[PDB]
Amino acid sequence: DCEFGYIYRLAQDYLQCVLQIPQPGSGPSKTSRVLQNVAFSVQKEVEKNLKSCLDNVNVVSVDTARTLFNQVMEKEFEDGIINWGRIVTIFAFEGILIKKLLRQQIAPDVDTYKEISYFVAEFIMNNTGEWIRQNGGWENGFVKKFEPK
């Protein structure tokens, strides 16, 4: 919880969900299962509401995805506010990016989602990791908030 490895697994779990290529055995964690549901709901909403905007950017490489991600993330969190809903949008956005990359990547490579997962975990750990810890981590913060009633 809250170290790179844990967050990377969450990010990679979510991209495999979006890409419909789950790892067989032994399945995602409780946290990941709760996250997949809420993040996908947000992703759908965003894809609909920013369609034309998202059509006017070309995600042609992992570097394009990384730079677009980092620039968007910087602007999203520039006011210094962190909350669990904003954390969810990070996962929703990497889902949007991997889908665009699958369509638009000039040299399609199959290990790209692992690269996307990496820089997502890097951002989450370095920019929201202290907040996450202070608010209960994934199991006592995120899951407690978002798990079913």
Partner: peptide, 26 residues
Amino acid sequence: QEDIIRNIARHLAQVGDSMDRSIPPG
């Protein structure tokens, strides 16, 4: 012209803040 980066960032912040408020303290 329309700033793609800021428009995406602005929307994600709004949706994140909106959803966060939607789920009460539980």
